[PDB]
């Protein structure tokens, strides 16, 4: 009929589904834009917290 009072929803819908991940190693979905004028090197690294 209409809330009555207004509040923000709870939690962010841009993080669904709130599912277990397919892997312990989260995936790099994106790399830095490439500038081919610079020397060659990695763009990421592995380690343990």
């Amino acid at each position: 009929s209409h809330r009555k009072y207004e509040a923000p929803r709870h939690g962010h819908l841009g993080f669904l589904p709130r599912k277990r991940a397919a892997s312990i190693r989260a995936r790099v979905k994106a790399f830095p834009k490439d500038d081919r004028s610079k020397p060659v090197a990695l763009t990421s690294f592995l380690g343990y917290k």
Binding site: F31, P32, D34, R36, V40, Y48
Partner: protein, 96 residues
Amino acid sequence: LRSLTTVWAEHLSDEVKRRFYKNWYKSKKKAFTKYSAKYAQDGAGIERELARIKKYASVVRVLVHTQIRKTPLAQKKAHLAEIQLNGGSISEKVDW
């Protein structure tokens, strides 16, 4: 974006080698043993692959893995993963 080839190093640490397995102890550990042979023959095949990466390919990533044994952890099985390589020029990339 579509993967075209992968070229691999000749020798591969047991650390990576054992990521390719689920029952390492019981296994004959034959992983990459026919591949390793491809170097023998002058080099021929690994070249044309590197060579073909060079010719086509919009991007190049490197296959690297952690030295998990240099780490106090228990799990002997390392982590392997692709890292995009940004320094200049496709060919300069794959040489690197």
